[PDB]
Amino acid sequence: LDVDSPAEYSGPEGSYFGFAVDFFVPSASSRMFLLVGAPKANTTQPGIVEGGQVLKCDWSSTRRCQPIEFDATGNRDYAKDDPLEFKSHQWFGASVRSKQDKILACAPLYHWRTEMKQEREPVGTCFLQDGTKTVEYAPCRSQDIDADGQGFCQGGFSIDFTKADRVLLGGPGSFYWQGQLISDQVAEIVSKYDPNVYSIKYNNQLATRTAQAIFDDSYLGYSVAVGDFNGDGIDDFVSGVPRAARTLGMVYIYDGKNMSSLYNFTGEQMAAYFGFSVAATDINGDDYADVFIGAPLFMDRGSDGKLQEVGQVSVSLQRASGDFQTTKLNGFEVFARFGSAIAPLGDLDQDGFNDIAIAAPYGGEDKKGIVYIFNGRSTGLNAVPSQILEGQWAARSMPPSFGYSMKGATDIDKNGYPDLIVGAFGVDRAILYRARPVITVNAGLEVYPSILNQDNKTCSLPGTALKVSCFNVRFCLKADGKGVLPRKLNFQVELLLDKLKQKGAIRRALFLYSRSPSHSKNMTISRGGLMQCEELIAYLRESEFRDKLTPITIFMEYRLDYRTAADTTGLQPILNQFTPANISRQAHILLDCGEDNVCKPKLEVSVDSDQKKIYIGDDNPLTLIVKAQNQGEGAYEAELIVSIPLQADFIGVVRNNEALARLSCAFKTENQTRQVVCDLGNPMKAGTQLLAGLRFSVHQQSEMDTSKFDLQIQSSNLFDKVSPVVSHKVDLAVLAAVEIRGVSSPDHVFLPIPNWEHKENPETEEDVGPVVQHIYELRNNGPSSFSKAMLHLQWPYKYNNNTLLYILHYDIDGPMNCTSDMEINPLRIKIGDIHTLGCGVAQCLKIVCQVGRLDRGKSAILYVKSLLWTETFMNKENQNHSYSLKSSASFNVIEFPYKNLPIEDITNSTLVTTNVTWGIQPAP
Amino acid sequence: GPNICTTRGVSSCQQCLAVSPMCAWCSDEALPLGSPRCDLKENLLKDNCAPESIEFPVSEARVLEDRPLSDKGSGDSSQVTQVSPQRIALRLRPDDSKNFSIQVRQVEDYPVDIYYLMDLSYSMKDDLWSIQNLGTKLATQMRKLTSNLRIGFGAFVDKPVSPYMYISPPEALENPCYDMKTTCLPMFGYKHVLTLTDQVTRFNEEVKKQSVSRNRDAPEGGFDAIMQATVCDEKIGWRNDASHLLVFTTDAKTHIALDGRLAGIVQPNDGQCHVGSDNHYSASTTMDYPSLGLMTEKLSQKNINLIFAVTENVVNLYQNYSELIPGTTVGVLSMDSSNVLQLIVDAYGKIRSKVELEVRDLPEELSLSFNATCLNNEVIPGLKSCMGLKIGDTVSFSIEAKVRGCPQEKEKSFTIKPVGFKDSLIVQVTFDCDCACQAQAEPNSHRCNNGNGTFECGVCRCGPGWLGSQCECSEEDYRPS
Numbered sequence A: 001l002d003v004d005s006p007a008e009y010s011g012p013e014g015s016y017f018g019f020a021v022d023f024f025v026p027s028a029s030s031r032m033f034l035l036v037g038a039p040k041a042n043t044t045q046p047g048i049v050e051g052g053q054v055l056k057c058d059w060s061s062t063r064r065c066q067p068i069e070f071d072a073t074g075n076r077d078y079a080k081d082d083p084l085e086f087k088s089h090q091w092f093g094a095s096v097r098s099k100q101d102k103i104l105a106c107a108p109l110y111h112w113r114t115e116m117k118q119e120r121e122p123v124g125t126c127f128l129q130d131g132t133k134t135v136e137y138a139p140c141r142s143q144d145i146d147a148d149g150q151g152f153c154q155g156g157f158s159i160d161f162t163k164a165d166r167v168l169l170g171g172p173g174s175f176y177w178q179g180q181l182i183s184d185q186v187a188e189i190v191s192k193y194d195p196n197v198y199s200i201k202y203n204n205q206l207a208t209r210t211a212q213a214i215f216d217d218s219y220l221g222y223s224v225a226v227g228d229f230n231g232d233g234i235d236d237f238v239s240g241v242p243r244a245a246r247t248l249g250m251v252y253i254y255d256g257k258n259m260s261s262l263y264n265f266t267g268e269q270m271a272a273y274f275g276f277s278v279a280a281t282d283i284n285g286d287d288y289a290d291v292f293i294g295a296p297l298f299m300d301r302g303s304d305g306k307l308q309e310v311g312q313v314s315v316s317l318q319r320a321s322g323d324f325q326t327t328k329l330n331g332f333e334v335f336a337r338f339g340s341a342i343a344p345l346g347d348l349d350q351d352g353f354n355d356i357a358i359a360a361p362y363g364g365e366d367k368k369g370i371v372y373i374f375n376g377r378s379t380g381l382n383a384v385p386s387q388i389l390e391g392q393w394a395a396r397s398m399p400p401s402f403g404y405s406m407k408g409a410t411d412i413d414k415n416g417y418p419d420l421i422v423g424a425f426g427v428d429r430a431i432l433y434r435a436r437p438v439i440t441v442n443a444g445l446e447v448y449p450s451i452l453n454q455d456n457k458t459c460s461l462p463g464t465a466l467k468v469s470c471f472n473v474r475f476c477l478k479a480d481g482k483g484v485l486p487r488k489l490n491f492q493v494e495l496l497l498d499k500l501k502q503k504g505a506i507r508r509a510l511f512l513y514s515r516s517p518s519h520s521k522n523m524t525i526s527r528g529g530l531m532q533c534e535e536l537i538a539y540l541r542e543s544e545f546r547d548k549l550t551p552i553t554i555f556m557e558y559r560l561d562y563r564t565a566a567d568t569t570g571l572q573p574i575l576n577q578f579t580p581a582n583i584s585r586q587a588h589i590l591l592d593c594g595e596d597n598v599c600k601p602k603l604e605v606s607v608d609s610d611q612k613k614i615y616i617g618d619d620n621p622l623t624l625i626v627k628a629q630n631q632g633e634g635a636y637e638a639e640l641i642v643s644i645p646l647q648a649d650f651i652g653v654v655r656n657n658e659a660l661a662r663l664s665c666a667f668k669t670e671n672q673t674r675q676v677v678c679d680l681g682n683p684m685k686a687g688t689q690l691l692a693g694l695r696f697s698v699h700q701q702s703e704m705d706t707s708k709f710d711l712q713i714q715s716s717n718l719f720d721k722v723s724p725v726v727s728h729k730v731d732l733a734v735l736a737a738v739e740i741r742g743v744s745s746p747d748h749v750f751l752p753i754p755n756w757e758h759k760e761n762p763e764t765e766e767d768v769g770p771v772v773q774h775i776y777e778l779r780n781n782g783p784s785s786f787s788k789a790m791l792h793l794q795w796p797y798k799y800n801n802n803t804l805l806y807i808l809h810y811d812i813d814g815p816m817n818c819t820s821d822m823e824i825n826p827l828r829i830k831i832g833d834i835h836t837l838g839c840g841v842a843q844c845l846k847i848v849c850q851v852g853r854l855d856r857g858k859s860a861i862l863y864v865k866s867l868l869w870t871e872t873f874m875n876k877e878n879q880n881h882s883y884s885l886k887s888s889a890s891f892n893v894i895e896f897p898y899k900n901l902p903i904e905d906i907t908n909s910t911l912v913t914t915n916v917t918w919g920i921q922p923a924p
Numbered sequence B: 001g002p003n004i005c006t007t008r009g010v011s012s013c014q015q016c017l018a019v020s021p022m023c024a025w026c027s028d029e030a031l032p033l034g035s036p037r038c039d040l041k042e043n044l045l046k047d048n049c050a051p052e053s054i055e056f057p058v059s060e061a062r063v064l065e066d067r068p069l070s071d072k073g074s075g076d077s078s079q080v081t082q083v084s085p086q087r088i089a090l091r092l093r094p095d096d097s098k099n100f101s102i103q104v105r106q107v108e109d110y111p112v113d114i115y116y117l118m119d120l121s122y123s124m125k126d127d128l129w130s131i132q133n134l135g136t137k138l139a140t141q142m143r144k145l146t147s148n149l150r151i152g153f154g155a156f157v158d159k160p161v162s163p164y165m166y167i168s169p170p171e172a173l174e175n176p177c178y179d180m181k182t183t184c185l186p187m188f189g190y191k192h193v194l195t196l197t198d199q200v201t202r203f204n205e206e207v208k209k210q211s212v213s214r215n216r217d218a219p220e221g222g223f224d225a226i227m228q229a230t231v232c233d234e235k236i237g238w239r240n241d242a243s244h245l246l247v248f249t250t251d252a253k254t255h256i257a258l259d260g261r262l263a264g265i266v267q268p269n270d271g272q273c274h275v276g277s278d279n280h281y282s283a284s285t286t287m288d289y290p291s292l293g294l295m296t297e298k299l300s301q302k303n304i305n306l307i308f309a310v311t312e313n314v315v316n317l318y319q320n321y322s323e324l325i326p327g328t329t330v331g332v333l334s335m336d337s338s339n340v341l342q343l344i345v346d347a348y349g350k351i352r353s354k355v356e357l358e359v360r361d362l363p364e365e366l367s368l369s370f371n372a373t374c375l376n377n378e379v380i381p382g383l384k385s386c387m388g389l390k391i392g393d394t395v396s397f398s399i400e401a402k403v404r405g406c407p408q409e410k411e412k413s414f415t416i417k418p419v420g421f422k423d424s425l426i427v428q429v430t431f432d433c434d435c436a437c438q439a440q441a442e443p444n445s446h447r448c449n450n451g452n453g454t455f456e457c458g459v460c461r462c463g464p465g466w467l468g469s470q471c472e473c474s475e476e477d478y479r480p481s
């Protein structure tokens, strides 16, 4: 249904123009018109105000609307100054029905001066216009006066034309508003007309009769329709009775030959107004009329369980046995009054099944009205609406009521598809929607080599001698369509060589010529069986991509060139609703495991480090010597991922030994981790094992860390792509190589010293003798550090009751604290063969030193300064004797910063010697 | 060794008392040297400070006045008391507070509004007496169940248009009973007669001063009247707190939405107040009847309870209608009205209250924490509400006060008021942050070290170069002795 440029008509403001609409298709002439009711338009009839009008509108010929000269007579006089009828404010045009040349309009609110007594009574009336003759028709203007008879019949409230030129008319007010149906032959209506007679009687009239008082205020005749429900070939009458059965509502079907009741439908909810609008039409192509009944005010359980007013439509399919099959449709909004108007459309799309429009005139945004189109299918109506038309005029002083009246099933433009007319009497408008031709397009795409091989590199790449693999893609388009359509349609086709690959990551296929993953072409097609086809040759990139498992998807989409496919009036065609706008198909590529296209891996990992012990310091980079293997059908895009400790940092693969693979690798910190990612073949050859030679910095910068790497091998395989987790744990060794050494200066001395004299109470350095200085060094020449250690140093003090080396002082480098067990500088002195002398035979002095932190390779020193006691050697006990004084130093470590790690008690010692000789020996 | 009374470098009574309630200053000069004058309260009383040399101020709340919460509904000396206590005093130590309880008990009778809708169709001529008797007895009954009853009424016949109206004879417009040669009032759509008022006698007289009219079709336009009585607030006089009842009387079927198309009325009911200054439904002839959905929606929107008071022969019909309008009851209208009065008695029995506290005159310097002990002794900290209260039901709220430091004003007040209830609890608030000892201040006079300071609480606030316990020492002077 065209919805962008429909035909809009307007009547005089406040005229209700559009209350009732219909088509006019004269048999004599060829042009078609629209008939629209204006039940409040102001007419030129003498003395009549708001008499109502029926307007004929020209459609394409400038869309002019002009009134029909139905009646130019004001009130008639039953006597001088005694009016007979009250045409003013009659709702003439409240119901318009046209069949060939017969136009029938009705005024339900026409009161006439009862012939027996001066009195108003709305008997209603109608006008029937043939080619040129025009007559007035009013069954209820009879001698059955008053409400108890046909006084308030209000005939013409609803009307319809029977297939065999019988007019059916519904008076909802007859017999105390019980209602009534009157069916009369048009020929008898025109033949019996007599202007001087007001109660004309027709011989072949079919009418219902008065019933008991229990049926009062039932409103039979509120709406009418025609359809055959007993198979006699003569259309039967269907009427809605919205107030029957304690207000439940009902629908009566009366035989169209003797007016005998056939079927009764009953509602289920009070006051739902089940029967406001009825429609008979076959909705499943079974040739049996089906009944649609509207209940605009039906209330149903809401989301919260509370009743909400949405309306309802009951669809009763007829069956041969006489039963009925009833389903129901519910409205999609609250207070929208869905089901107010039901309009058969005929085959709106030529799908073979009749389609129906249902109006919710107070739905949509701003309550501007809405209309839903339901397409008929075999076995019932498609409960899901296919199209939704929305009102476009805002309320001036009254709801627009768009969709309050509808009429379809007439091809006004002669394009082979029926059109629709909708009334917006709230804004006094009428809108014609033209149905568009429905083109059904069958598109067939096929890739002959569904599975493609790189090895089939038999195709010459244009522009270069290089070779590629060429595969075929075929695409065919056939566009069928009923009705007036252009003989030729310019379709546009677009093909994508690789769907998915989101964000344009990579596309592995390109057309042989003008390499590009997309290609579009305009191909003409003529409506017919010629399945016009075209082919393209596309080639894949050897190692330009890293994903050879996910299938390559070919995608095709076609767009009809609507612009040039329209008619001369500018009505563009449409494509079928259910046909998919795109067709996609799957290609494939395989490596190894040919028979098992679904290729299954079986991965396995192992790890065993060579130097599984570390010294907690500067050492060779740690290498795991990882083993990776597979025994499955393969391993695609295999990669080894190793998570390393924070103390380990990635190092390049080992090139010293060629047995290890020449594997490129990289590092990342995804998700706050420490990952080393290397490749293991894409794919692994029969799962053949590989040997890793990667290294790591294993930089241990936290003494509290205890002793581990984890690792895995994964692949791009679609299943079983994760290998078992394999972890290794190296150990930490405390290689704190502590060494103690020393030196003495001078290394030798000659006695007696030059310019020296014996002194009994020396007070300065010169008085005692030469200065002897000893340096001791403790160095932790190892990768492992210690936090606290114990240091010792023993010194020779006195030999033969005589001092050997008179200590002057001891100096601390700073990394240790020292304490002397014996008095230092007791007297407070101002600062042949050689025999060994030391603490073994001589009174000895020792100084105990506690050493603090000593890092990797760090060292500390201790200094001792002493004076050589010359008088000791000048004594008789040592005269002409040469000696070698000895001292020893020792260390012992006690506390390491690696508190968690094991601590080993390591100790050692060394010696420092000085030489003294008698320079002035006796003459030989 | 107090956590904050000495660690904060406390040296003044004012700040010693202002830092926290746990901190107090020992003032007497007789205190021997030792722990500071602001030791922990638990041990400061024994840490060389005599009992009379220290004060331990503590926040407290005093219930000066209280009253039993009017257990029974009889008259009181002045009026019933709904909330207790009546007034309390609260001396709050800086940054100190505690708990106090307030209990509420509904004793006042509920406010009720009744609107009576009378069908004045000709079919009711035999039922007019029953309508009048029911209208009188509604008040006579409810007045004995409550005291805030307001009553009113209106009437309806049908839309004044063809085919419903009697328009045919020129002189029948003023007497639709022209055919029977009797007189009946001209027919009308809907007219609001008497607003909701407490004058029961006026309502009785007006109801008994009514007469019937006549239209054509048996169904009536009562739904228009219901909708207008619902959506019109000022005209009807609905109260925002009273329980609203809308009694509706009829004896025949009812017109429903889309029945007006027969009369040329196709505009859907607007659902707006359309009663003009003449107390007539001015949109009767141009707007259709209202659908049941709209009626239910508007009844719910304004908390109006709808009761059908219908005759026997239609009761079932309207009974079924009640199923489509949840929250509505139906009763037989007859000479014996007890059956339909039981509906109103039950409806009144169904009334329930709400309790919500208020905070009116509090400043930003004070706050409360609420803990509600609602019905069934269910305790729930963190709210100020309670539902499902009958007459005589009781709830309580334990409230913990809180004050920031020492507010800038010594005296204040705040009133706690239950929602709707006129009664309230008034709380007077005072603060005693100032040091009582500081009343003996002596700036630069005798004591201290020849002046040069201000003796306040055993310590002299000495000037520059005079810092010390009694200004005997300077800021940067040390005694080698």
Ligand SMILES: CC(C)[C@H]1C(=O)N[C@@H](CCCNC(=N)N)C(=O)NCC(=O)N[C@H](CC(=O)O)C(=O)N[C@H](Cc2ccccc2)C(=O)N1C
Binding pocket: A148, A175, A176, A210, A211, A212, A213, A216, B121, B122, B123, B213, B214, B215, B216, B217, B218, B219, B220
């Ligand atoms: C007969 C009498 C006992 C009774 C009655 O039955 N009225 C019906 C019967 C019509 C059915 N006839 C058919 N051939 N199908 C009727 O006409 N109803 C429509 C109406 O006119 N109702 C009005 C109320 C109104 O104005 O709102 C009103 O006049 N009802 C009268 C009231 C009455 C009762 C008893 C004596 C006199 C009048 C009514 O109930 N009937 C006429």
